[PDB]
């Protein structure tokens, strides 16, 4: 019932496209459809110099 954030907006019907830095994972892929990635990335740690 609770899809918080921009994902809920697309699913509910407010917006039919979610152009944004949206990561591709299993949970979202089950409900919405993901296009081919436009940028390959991965989690990393940022620390102060």
């Amino acid at each position: 019932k609770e899809w918080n954030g921009m994902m809920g907006e697309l699913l509910s019907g407010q917006a039919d496209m979610i152009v944004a830095p949206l990561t591709i994972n299993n949970e979202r892929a089950q409900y919405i459809e993901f296009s081919k990635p436009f940028k390959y990335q991965g989690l990393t740690i940022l620390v102060k110099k």
């Binding site: 591709i24 892929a29 081919k36 990635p37 390959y40």
Partner: protein, 49 residues
């Protein structure tokens, strides 16, 4: 290939990358002979005088 067939989520990344041999043994720069800060050298000169 994606126009006549239907691919899936890319499970491995690829691309036109560049391979360059690493420069073994980085040489100390010209200004590597000064471990002392510039204020260090000036203070030493003033003390000598």
């Amino acid at each position: 290939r994606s126009e006549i067939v239907d691919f899936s989520v890319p499970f491995v990344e690829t691309g036109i990358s560049v391979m360059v041999a690493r420069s073994n043994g980085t040489v100390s720069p010209s200004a590597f002979l000064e471990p002392y800060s510039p204020a260090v050298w000036v203070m030493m000169f003033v003390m000598c005088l």
